[PDB]
Symmetry: none
């Protein structure tokens, strides 16, 4: 027949013990050790594939959260809000299926290859042990059969009776070796075929779960896509419209005068904010700018944009404004009270007029 250990083991000389037969027993064994190292190399690689597999999916699962989270960090688009949720449950669904494929991999390696190296050479190596012990027994059997003198007939007959023992039971041991090598030639091919069966089985099972919802994924891929191409043409147009209006402001209507602080919530909330230059009444003294706010009849400044406000004067009920006639600088006015009295300057003619008006107005509310 055509088997790899079959064609290099001599069945025909197996009761007969020629140097040929001793050569085949030795020769066939080399494949046995070969096959056992290749089985072991396959188990080591199997955990390497399990290790990298489980790291490729840990990297993948972080990526899918992260791709979604970034889109979620953006300004919102409703088709994306629902499609991204369909994509998310589907994407993770492939990773838990492919993680199952590893565990399946791990399992088949245990059922098959590990069982195979663990169980499958035990009964042949124990038959090998006793066969070579019997060889040993046969050689001393021959040794004791040859060295007797012909005059000591009874002793020699006793020694030849043990040789009939050695030779027979060595034929008996040789048959068992023959049986057991004859099992592993048929067995080796099937088990590893089974292993490959179970490999491409889990693959077929994994692509089919991912192929099965493919229609649900494909409707969203189109409906997100048709919407994105209308959005881009809509943004093109909106930004065309925005570039031309951007153009227009710079052409002829932008203005050079300071913009005006806008009062709201009538004279008793009187909400108005704007910067001024302030100066105190110390003997050595200087100007700095602060951002001012009249809110709830309360005049307040803040050293910075993100600083909490502080009162220019605690209460503004007993205060009076002086529009200076004589001031070192143009556009200066002065604000006088029980304590915290101070000098102010504004940036242009209408801001001075308004700021003094609004602040004098707030004094009327407060005083009311």
């Amino acid at each position: 027949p055509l088997g790899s250990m079959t064609v290099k083991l001599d069945f025909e000389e197996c009761l007969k013990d020629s140097p040929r037969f001793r050569a085949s027993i030795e020769l066939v064994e080399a494949e046995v050790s070969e096959l056992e190292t290749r089985l072991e190399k396959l188990l080591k690689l199997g955990t390497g594939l399990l290790e990298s597999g489980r790291h490729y999916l840990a990297a993948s699962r972080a990526f899918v959260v992260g791709i979604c989270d970034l889109a979620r960090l953006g300004p919102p688009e409703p088709m994306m809000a629902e499609c991204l949720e369909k994509f998310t449950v589907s994407l993770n669904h492939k990773l838990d299926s492919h993680a199952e494929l590893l565990d399946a991999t791990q399992h088949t390696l245990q059922q098959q290859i590990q069982t195979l190296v663990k169980e499958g050479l035990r009964g042949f190596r124990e038959a090998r042990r006793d066969f070579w012990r019997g060889a040993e027994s046969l050689e001393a059997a021959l040794t004791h059969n040859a060295e007797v003198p012909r005059r000591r007939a009874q002793e020699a007959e006793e020694a030849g009776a043990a040789l009939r023992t050695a030779r027979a039971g060595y034929r008996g041991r040789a048959l068992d070796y023959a049986l057991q090598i004859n099992v592993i030639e048929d067995k080796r091919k099937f088990d590893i075929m089974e292993f490959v069966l179970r490999l491409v089985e889990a693959q077929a099972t994994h692509f089919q779960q991912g192929h099965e919802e493919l229609s649900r994924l494909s409707q969203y891929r189109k409906e997100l896509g048709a919407q994105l191409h209308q959005l881009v043409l809509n943004s093109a147009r909106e930004k065309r419209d925005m570039e031309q209006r951007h153009v227009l402001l710079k052409q002829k209507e932008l203005g050079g005068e300071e913009p005006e602080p806008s009062l709201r919530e009538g004279p008793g909330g009187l909400v108005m904010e704007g910067h001024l230059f302030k100066r105190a009444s110390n003997a050595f003294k200087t100007w700095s700018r602060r951002w001012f706010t009249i809110q709830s009849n309360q005049l307040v400044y803040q050293k910075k944009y993100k600083d909490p406000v502080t009162v220019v004067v605690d209460d503004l009920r007993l205060c009076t404004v002086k529009l200076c006639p004589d001031s070192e600088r143009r556009f200066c006015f002065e604000v006088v009270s029980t304590s915290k009295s101070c000098l102010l300057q504004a940036d242009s003619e209408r801001l001075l007029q308004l700021w003094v008006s609004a602040v004098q107005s707030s004094i009327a509310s407060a005083f009311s």
Copy 2:
């Protein structure tokens, strides 16, 4: 955080709604770039992990192949076992094309965005804060005007004018880019996701076509496999059952008997014999001897040239040694060379003595 679509009204009047929107869009740009650039190193790492995975698989598929050339080269092994493993390598290469296309995807969108996608926002912003630096300075400058003065007033005020007009033109460019970033952060990330989902999906579509045919192959072969090994289970038990019958009933204790039968040039016989060594103690040793073409040779290893024991047999005599101490022995004495020898039975003595004795008559 701030409101979407920031328009020019607020920009040009230096509103606190503008003032806070510019505060919050810059802080959004630092978060965004960091997360994009993290998503960039993580998508880098994913390809590296995929590619380590495909090499891990590629080495595992060579280990299943190695079994296959060791084995016998029969039809099911020769064709099926090869079609299963080549389909495994084909799938690794296709999957390589998906990691090549993921890389393309990532180098197109996310690399470009990190590298040169914030660059005109940062141009507009540094030019814009430059405008307000100069306007902060010219508001100071505008304020250092003595009340007596009029030529200093118009001179100071002209410097404030151009500072304010330019801050406003610079404001229009920051605003417009704040709208461009806002749609770019939506569309570059939406196209990225949709490209990736699209290209993953085709690999399964095409995959399943083939691997569902391979499922069919698997279940058909796998069905032949369970019966084949049941067949075997019966087979090697039948063999064991003959063997205990062989051992109990037909097992032989007698020595293997050599055969004196014609070949290419006359009678041939080959077999074990004991002889004495050439060491100083002359110690006995077992070798395999052949009678062929009127010659006696001895084999020194299996599959290696033989050594001659007697040059010719037609010039030999054969000693049946009746007065020797040694048992089952004969001596062959030829003109150039002699050899004592010893056999395992009285049958084997007479059969080796008769074979040499017919040989001496050739």
Copy 3:
């Protein structure tokens, strides 16, 4: 039944695997290890007996040579000359037979006890190895049968099918252990009985070879003995006769005068020996005694009993004797020649007269 391993191994629970059965497998083994150390102690003692045996006969064989050689060194008795030869061949004959008994001892220890420890526990310990491997297999078989969840029905059925494997083939392994312990209980008793059979066999064979010539030895023991008792009565009488004659010489006839030198072989051999006192002719000179001899007409002296003789004068043909009238001492005579001339003195009146006569006589022969 009544066997030592039989009555502490539970056949009845051997398919059934109770803690009792696990306890018996363990319990019975302790006797197995016991029996193997006692077999080994018997082999060590066997070479000690071989070592001392071979030294007791090396000491014995030297003694038998030495007992004979001492008798052979004595003054000779003819019945002893033949009986000692019969005793010698018979005595050695027991030592070569008892040396054969050792070699026989050595042989039986190899055939029996060494074969027994070498071959006889191999197939039971290999059955023990696989039985406890099957136990191992059974425990993980139970382990994998118990830890499956009830929802995973197919997987659990597969795991229980392997347990039907484990349990069955463990029953199969248990039977082999049962077979093989059941062989060693019958076997242990016989082999060591055989060993004791072969011991007292070689003894019976040794006393019978030594009992078989006992009649030949017994005739010599008597004939040497009857002769020794006549010899002692004969020696008693001979020594009585010798004591009384010893008595007689001292009583009345011993004599006080110097004994006389006895000439023989006539005047031309003239053989006569006796001491004298000699003096040379030197100017400072003195007396000493030497033992003189006239032999073959040659007058010679010797400084000692065991010294070779030297000539008083080379030749005695041309010499003359002077019987001194004037001499310092009594009984002196003088002997004159061509060279070596000298003065002599003798011990008493008849020795002087004779010595001068004999020496003058020898001169006449010589001169003839």
Copy 4:
């Protein structure tokens, strides 16, 4: 060497035949004593070697005895194996009596001869050479006489007279002892050999009487031994032949099934179960459990006191657990104590659940 029976003629005339016989008898006495005293240390060494031999044997016969008390105490072992080995010890003690009698023999003759058997020869010899010392001196003295003198002549000569008479009486005593030594060296050595040959011979005579009856015992038992072990050879093969028939045809894969059958106080069942440990992980473990006298106990080692699992069964309930994850499990819940348990089959669940359920009705 010299002639035998040395008589008084030669002695009293101071002959050279005497003069050489006295030279050679003293040299024979030095050889003799040395060889006797060597024969004395070697006969010492022989007893020491014999006694080392009897102790070597005595320890070997205890090693064959040790087998015998290990074994079964059956009639052939009990009586024959003991009669063989006690005959071995009996023979050691008899042989001890022969080494005691060899020692007696050696201390009687050869020790005495070395110690005090040369002593009167050495007395006579030193007294005799003393006589010749004085006669050598008085021959000198006899010779120092001036020729003129007559009173010196008779005075010197009288000293020579008594010296010569006494040398002659001393000569008679050396001579007579030279005859006594000559017969003593023959008769002490002849009696020694004959005593030894005589006493060796009786031990075989008596030995063979018994050991030839023991040969008879040996061949009769030994004949029962070859058939007995042929009988056995058939026996254990018959057993092997049933066993391959048992394995092939009757071997069972099913779990051992417990039995619910009445005893001293009602229904009894005992058997393996799985339970959960009291460690912090709560890890599962297999123990052997007994239901007896309305109680459930568990065994903690073979042949050692048991531990109670539930105090009473008439106060228990029994959970068939249909919604549990764990397979083939039940729970027994009693007032003081509960226990989860797990069995190997759906048969064993129902049988352990029914046994507790009959027990709950007691």
